[PDB]
C-alpha cells in the first residue's frame, strides 16, 4: 500500500486481507485512493483514466480502509472529465456585439382587428434569449421531483407508481440512475430526482426503510451548464399550424432523444462509486459513471494517467477542503469504537474550463 | 432591560421626548442608540452613539446622554413619525446588548 | 450593497431543535460581527447572541446552553441553532449586522426577519 | 440473457432507492424511507445500460413511462406513456 | 481601432442594461482589447456566435445567477498573456397568420437551468427555422381489439434512430448554423498600449487614470 | 506576463507599464503571482524560495493587476515554511506509555502542623503537563491585548502609552511587528496584539483615522503550536527561596530571550506581503516576513524552487478555496467602475506537517 | 508482542480518560502496531519522549481543542505503508521546606496556547530542574543622582548574549534531556497480521470482528 | 544610518497602526482607529530588524517597555521596564 505521484501519472497500490468461506471485486474508487490522495487528484487535475456481474455496483468489494478484513462475496477510453464549466451553453456569445442575424419581433401592430404584421429585429445583447446558436443541450428523460422537506410532498404513496421506468418483454424496470441530467435548478437544493441520483448509505445504516438522514444523496448540479434539468421538460415544440382560425399551440417535451448538435456531460464519479463497466449501442459510457475456510492477502496496483490544469483564469478556484472547526472526531478517520466512516460523497468536479 | 416610558404622544409640530434609564454598569458606561420600528417590518436606525445619526435620518430627530439616563428628541413631530421606538445599549455586567421596553408614538 | 435573508422551517414541534440560516448576499461577511435578535409577536426585542466572522461567539447569558451559532465563510452564510424549544420561543427572528466592523455599537443592516411558530 | 438481469442474484447493491413516501393512511403522513437495492427487489436496481430505441424492446408495447409534472402537496404525481423513443447514451 | 473603456477592464451585467428579464440575464466583463493569439484556446471563444465585424471590442460572459455572480464564475485578464423538432408555421401573407402575438409564446424553445432559449435555427429540416439577414409521422397509441379501434398519434419531435464545445459527448458536431472543429482558427487579440499623460510631481499611490487619446 | 509550472520549479513573469515624473520596487508578492497561481502554490507545496530603502515595506511597487499603469516613487536562503504543524510542541509524547522519569507530586500529607513530606510519581498519560520535554517554545516579548469588541477595552487613551516599544539613543520606537508570536489563544479571535500583527488596508481606504472594517488584520494563529501567544506571559519563574518561614514566590515572564532548546516558526508571508529585506546579528530572517516626463515597459522574471508535499496523512487537508455564493462582484477581479481589489489577505500555511 | 486493540485503530481523548483538565487535555489515536521502517519520518516520532520499553503499543497525539479535534488534525493509517530560568529550590531536609503545597503552584512553567507546561528538566544549570529515575546577577534599575540612590534588582531569567522538530528556527538543538538530529534513527513498526476465525457461511458485508487469539 | 531610520523618508508604508482608541468628545467612548504609518510619524513603522541585546542600545538606559497586564474596561494598560534583554531573532 502506497501511492506514487510522478509527473502526469499516478500509481496506486492497495493491500487487503480477506477470508473465504467466489470472486474479487475492486471496482469502487475508494479501494485504490485515500481521501487525501483523492483530494490531491481532484483539485489539481482536469482528467484521469486507468492504464460478468462486476458492473452491477454490488457489495463485497474491497474495504475502503486497509486495516479492515473482508469476507469474499459468493458468485452467481477517454478521460473522465473532472471539471465544471465556467460558462453555460446559452451564454457563449460576446455581450458587447450584435449578431448580424434577425428574429421576428412583432406579429401584431397592436390590439384590434386584422392587425397582422411582421416586424424583425437584430438579435443582440439587449434581447439575449433569441440569438442563434450552433449547439443545444443534450437529451432528457424526465424524472419526478421529490423534496427533502416532507411537508412539500403530497400525502400519497407515489414511490413506485410515479417513478419513470422502461419495460423490456413485459417487465417494468425502474429508470435508475438514467441519463445524465442536472439534479435541480439553481437556488433549489432540497429537490432531487426520484431515481435520477446515486444514493449512498452512511456508516451503519440499516438495510430496510431508513430515514433520509441515514443516506447520502449525490447531486449533479455541476453539469447543469450543458445538461437539461432532470425534473424539467426539455422544452416546447409546435403542435399545430396557426391560422386566422386557430391559435399557435405548443407542448412540453418530456423525453428527448439525441439530435445532431447536442453536447452533454456524463455523470460524475465519486470516491464511493464504480469505476468500470462492461459494454453488453450509442455512447457506451455507463449510466452510473465510470469507464466502459481459507484466508490470504490481496494487493492490487493501478496506473492512472492524468490531465493537467492549463487554465489562465485569474481569480482563485473552488477547492475541496476540510473545514477547520472543532468536532468530536475527525472526518475520514475511525471513532472511539474503531469504526472507519465516510462523512460525505466526494464528487470529482472542482476545477473549471471555458465551454 | 432598560426602563422606558410605555407611550409618548403629541400633535404635529410639537417636540416629543423619549427617555430611557439604566444602571451605571449599563447605560452609564458605554453608549446608547435608537431604533425606530414601523409595524410589520424590521427596525430602522435613528440615532447611534448617543448624539449622532445616519444620513438617511432627518435632522429633526435628536439624541443625548446624561449620566445614566439618555433621551431621544423629536422636533417638529409629523404623522410619519408614528411608530415604535427602542433604545439599545451594551451591558458590561451581562456582556451583551440590552433592549429597552418599546415606546409607541401617537400623533394627536 | 448588503442583503440579509433568513430561511428556516416556519413550524417546529415543541422540544425540537430550531434551525435558522442567514445568507448574506452582495457583500462578504469578513471583518464584521453578525447577530441574531429575536422578537415575540407584539413584544419587545431580545438579543440572542452574535458571532464574529472568524468564529468568536458571544451569547445572551440566560440563553446559553440552549443556543449555538455557526458561521460558514465559504458559503458566506451564517446560522443559529436553538434547542428544547417551547411556546416561549415562538417569535420573529432577525439577522442583523453589527456596525462599523466593531462589536458593541448597534446594528447597521437588518434582515427581513422570519416567523417561527412552535406548535403541533 | 436479458438486459435487466445482468445483476448478481446473490448480492445487494450499495446503492439505495426510495421505498416509501408515506408512513400510512391518514393526514400528513409524508415521510421518506430508503431501502437497499437487492435480490429481493430486482426492478429497482441501478443499471449502467438501457434497451435500444423503440417506435411503436417489443414493437407492440410502450418503451416506458415518464413523469409529466412536479408533484406537490396539491398535485399528485402523474406519468405518461412513451410511444416512440430516440437514441439515448447507454442504449443497445 | 479605438481605445475602449479608457484602458479598463470593467464588469458588465444584466442590471447594467436594466435587466428585469430572467431569460435575458447575464454576467460578464468588457475588456480594452479588440479582436497576440490564443493558440491554447484558453480564453472564452466568442467567434462562433455570428457576431458583427473597424475592430470590435472584446468581452465575454461567465456563469451567473440573475445579475449576480456565483462562485464558480471566472475572470480573465488578457494582459496576463504574452429527426425533427417542429417549428411553428408562419405565412408571409399577413391575413393568413392568426391575429395574435405568438412570436415568443408560440416559438419552439429549450430550457437550460430554468432559462428558456429560443430554438434557433434548430435542427436541419419555420417560425425560428431559418436565418434572417439585413410532423414526423404517426405511431400506434394503443392496442386494437374487438372493443378498441386502432388509435394513432402524431410525432412532433423525433431523435436519431464554429468551435465544438469541450464536453464528454456530442453527436454530429457540425454547427447548427452551418459549416465545426475542436481546434478552430485561433482568436487574435489587439489593443493600443496605453500612453499616460503628464503625472503629478509629488508621488501618488493611486493608479494613473490620465491618458492620451489615440 | 505568464507562469510556467515545471516540476519543482515555477517561472513567474510580470510586465507592467510605468510613468516617471526614482527606483523600481517589485518586493511584494502580488507583483509576481496572480491569485490563482498563489493558490496553486500554497495548496500543493511545503516550501519555496527564489532563484537601501526597499526592505521598509513602502508603497510604489508594481500594481497587482497587470493592466494598471503606475507611477515610479521618488528615492530618498532557506525555504520559507508554508505549512501548519499538525502537532503542538507540548503533545509530542506517546499518549499510551509512561515515562520512566519521576516528578514531585506532594509536599504535604494533608492539613496540619509540620506536614512536610516529599512524594514522587511517574510522569504518564494521566498527567501530561509535567512530562520532561526535549524542547521549548521560542522567545516572546509581550504585546498589549486589544479587543475588537470595544466595550471590552478600557476607556482610556492607551494607544501610545501602553504599547511595547524599544528606545534607541533616546528615541522611542514602537515594536512592530516584533518577534513572531501567535496572535491569540485558541477560541479567542476578537482580541488582537497592539503592534503584533501586520494590518493591510482594503482597496480605497482613507489615509487616516479609518475604522476597523476598512483594514484587514492578519493573524499568525497557525504558529500557536511552536510559538507563545503574543499577549500572554511566556511563563512563570521562581522569585525567591522557600523556607519554613517564607512561602514560594513566582513571577510572570513578560519578555524572554533565546534559550538552548527553543524552536519556533517565523512570521508568515502574504500575497500582499514583502518578499525580501536587506540584512543591515541573530536569525537574520526579517520580522515582517520573507527572506533576508517619461514612460515605458518593465518586465521582471523570477525562478522559484518548490518543495513538494510528501505526506502520508490519510484524511483530507485543509485547503485554500474560493468562496461560493451569489455576490455583486467576483473576488480578486474588477468592479463595474473597473477597480481591482484584494478582499482578503492571503497567508501561506494550509498543508500540515508533523512536529 | 501481543495483539493490541483487537486489530483496531481507536481514537483517544482526555474524555476517554475521564475528562482530566485543561493543561492535561489531549486528543489522538491508538494503533494496533507496536514498536517496516519509516525512513522518511512521515509518522509522528514518539521516541524522544523518554517512554518505557515487552513491545509497547504505538499511538500519537495530534492537534486538539479540549477533547475535541480541530479540522487540522491528522490521521495516519500505518497499514497504508508497504542563560538561566530560575527553579524553585527544594531541600531534602523536610522541616526546612515550607508547610504548604507548593509543588505545582511554585513550579516554574511555560505556557503555550493557553496551557501551562512545567519546565522540565529545563535549561542546563531545584524542583523540576533535574532528572529522576526509579538568580543570574543584578542590574541597575534607575539613574543615580543627588536625590536617588543607585538601585539594583535581581535577574530571575536571562537569555543568550531526540529528534529535532522541523521548524523555521532553533537554537542549540541539543535536547534538554541530553543526547539531537534532524534525521534520528528511524522508527520501526511491527504487528501481527490478523487471521480471522471461521466466517459465516452466507455472505455479509460487515468487516470481520472474529479473530484467533495470538 | 541608525537602525530605526533605514526607511525611505519620502514614502508611506502600506502597513497600518492603531492611531486612536478614544474617538468621542467628552464622553471619550472607546473606538478603534487606524492610520497609515508614514513620514509624518516614523516612530510607529514596522521594522524588519531590532537592536541587539542590552544588559544595563545605550547601557545607561532601559531597552524598552512591555505590556504587563491585559487591559479591560476596569483595568488600565500597564507597561513595565526592560532592564535586560537576551537575544531575539532579528536583533543586530
Residue numbers in the entry:
A (entry chain F), F (entry chain C): 230 to 250, 282 to 311, 354 to 378, 420 to 623, 628 to 639, 674 to 736
B (entry chain L): 23 to 130
C (entry chain H): 20 to 139
D (entry chain E), H (entry chain B): 430 to 485, 571 to 606
E (entry chain D), G (entry chain A): 249 to 283, 345 to 362, 373 to 401, 482 to 524, 536 to 544, 576 to 602, 620 to 637, 639 to 673
Provide passages from the article that reported this PDB entry.
In each map, the capsid was well ordered, while the densities for the Fabs above the 2-fold axis could not be interpreted for model building. As for the 3-fold antibodies, only a single Fab bound to the 2-fold region, in two potential binding modes, resulting in distorted densities during icosahedral averaging. For the sixteen 2-fold binding Fabs, this strategy resulted in maps reconstructed to 2.54–3.56 Å resolution. The localized reconstructions with C2 symmetry relaxation confirmed that only a single Fab is bound at the 2-fold region. In all maps, the VH and VL chains are well-ordered, enabling the building of atomic models. The epitopes for the sixteen 2-fold Fabs comprise VR-III to -VII, and -IX of the AAV9 capsid. On the aa level, all 2-fold-Fabs contact D532 and Y706. Other frequently contacted residues are T491, T492, R533, D556, N562, N704, and Y705, which are clustered around the 2-fold symmetry axis. Furthermore, for all the 2-fold Fab-complexes, movements occurred in VR-IX near the 2-fold axis. While, for AAV9 capsids in absence of Fabs the residues 704–707 adopt the same conformation in both symmetry-related VR-IX loops surrounding the 2-fold axis, there are numerous variations of side-chain orientations in the different Fab complex structures.
The AAV vectors are composed of non-enveloped T = 1 icosahedral capsids, consisting of 60 viral proteins (VP), and package single-stranded DNA transgene cassettes. A major challenge for the utilization of AAV vectors in the clinic is the presence of pre-existing neutralizing antibodies (NAbs) in a large percentage of the human population. The presence of pre-existing neutralizing antibodies in large portions of the human population poses a significant challenge for AAV-mediated gene therapy, primarily targeting the capsid leading to vector inactivation and loss of treatment efficacy. This study structurally characterizes the interactions of 21 human-derived neutralizing antibodies from three patients treated with the AAV9 vector, Zolgensma®, utilizing high-resolution cryo-electron microscopy. The antibodies bound to the 2-fold depression or the 3-fold protrusions do not conform to the icosahedral symmetry of the capsid, thus requiring localized reconstructions. These complex structures provide unprecedented details of the mAbs binding interfaces, with many antibodies inducing structural perturbations of the capsid upon binding.
